[PDB]
Paper text:
We report the isolation and cloning of a two-domain Kunitz inhibitor from the cattle tick Boophilus microplus, which we have termed [name]. As implied form the sequence conservation, [name] consists of two canonical Kunitz domains that are connected by a 10-residue linker. In contrast to all previously discovered natural thrombin inhibitors, [name] potently inhibits additional trypsin-like serine proteinases, including trypsin and plasmin. Thrombin (E.C. 3.4.21.5), as the ultimate proteinase of the coagulation cascade, represents an attractive and perhaps obligatory target for these animals.
Numbering used by the authors:
A (entry chain B): 16 to 36, 36A, 37 to 60, 60A, 60B, 60C, 60D, 60E, ...
B (entry chain E): 16 to 142
C (entry chain A): 1P, 1O, 1N, 1M, 1L, 1K, 1J, 1I, ...
Write the structure that this text describes.
Amino acid sequence: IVEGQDAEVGLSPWQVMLFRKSPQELLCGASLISDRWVLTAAHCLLYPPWDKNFTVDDLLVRIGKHSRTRYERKVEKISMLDKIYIHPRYNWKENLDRDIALLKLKRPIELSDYIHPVCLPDKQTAAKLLHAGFKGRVTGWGNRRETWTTSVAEVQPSVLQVVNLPLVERPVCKASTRIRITDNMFCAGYKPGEGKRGDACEGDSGGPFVMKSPYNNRWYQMGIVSWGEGCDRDGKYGFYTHVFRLKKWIQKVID
Amino acid sequence: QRNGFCRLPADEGICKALIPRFYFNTETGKCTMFSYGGCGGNENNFETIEECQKACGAPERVNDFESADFKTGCEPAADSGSCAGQLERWFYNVQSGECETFVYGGCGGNDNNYESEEECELVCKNM
Amino acid sequence: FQPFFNEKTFGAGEADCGLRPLFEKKQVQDQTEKELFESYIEGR
Ligand code: NA
C-alpha cells in the first residue's frame, strides 16, 4: 500500500495473508467471507507467464494478522486449504478480466477480536454505494513504493497498511490506460490536483476494497485488488474486481 | 501480476528508426527484444532487459518472516497439562524432526503446543 | 440486513458479517472511517 498508514489492531478482521510455505513469502492478500471461505484474486493463484499454478499443498492462509513478519501466537490463525476455485473465464492473457478465486479452508476457523468475516454486497448495497467520489478502503502488506534504488527491503511495511480511496467514474478510468476495461472492473484513486495520493501495490493483490454502509453500519467488500499501472503514478488508477458483478459465480461455487 | 502494461503487445509504432528495446512476452514469459521505431507504441517498452524484468517478471520478495522461539516454542517435549480434556495438539519433536500429535488437557503445558500440523511446521521447521 | 448464502455450505458468520469486534461492536469509530462518511456528502 502506497501513501497509507499503519492499520489499527482489528481494523480489518477479515484481512487474510496468502502465504507460500516453501520459499516463505507473502504471495497475496485475501479476505474472510465466512468461517470457511476466503476470497482472493485469480492471478494470485494462476499466472502462466510466471509459470504460476499454486495447489493447496503450496499454500497457507494466515488470518488475524497485524505484523507482516511476527508470529502472532494466540491471535493469528494459520490454516491449510481444502479446495481452490478459479473463475473459468479468467482472462489472464489480456486484462485479468474476472480476477476472482475462492479458497475453501480445510477446517472452519473460530472467530475473535481479530478474525471476523466481511459482508458481500447485495443489489441495493451495490447501487447505493458504487458512486463516483465515494471512498472505499484498501488494506495489505505489499510494497510501500513502486520502485527502490538498492533493495526491495526499503519498501516493506512492518505492519498492515490502510488507505482510503475514492471510486472513479468509467470515462476517467478508461482514458488512464491502454488496457481494455470490463464491467467486471472498477477503478479507484485520486486524480491529479486533488492533492491526495494512495494506491495498492505489488503484494496487495487479492486484498479487499471495502466500504462501510451508512444504512446498516456493516462493511461490504466491493472489490478485490486486481491490477494497475505502476503504483501511485499521477494520471493512473488501481483496478479492482467488481465483486457484486461476479456474485452469481460466488454463489454457484459455494452451493 | 499487477502491471497491466506487461500484457500489451509489442508495438513498434509507425516511425522508421530501429531502436533495440525490450517487451514482456506473455506466451513465453520472457523479456524479449524488438525494434522500436522511436515514436508512440506502449508502456511494454524497456531500454534494458533488467528494467523489463523488474517491471514485468516475477518480483524480488522478502523472506524475513519470524518463526517460533525455538527454545521455548519447539524444543520442549510434549506436555498434557493438569486438566482432563482430550484435545489433539501438535508439537515439534526435536529427535524426529517432525511435528507430531499429542493429547492435551486444556490447561498448563508449554508453548510447543499447536492446533494444526501446518502451524507447527511453519513456526518450528524454519529458522 | 439479512444473509444471502446457505449456511450449510457457506458455514457460519454471514449474519454477523461486517461488524468488527473492536470497533462497531463497542461503538468505537476507527481513525479514518469519518473520511469515508464525509465522501458520501461529497460524491455523486
Ligand atoms: Na495515482
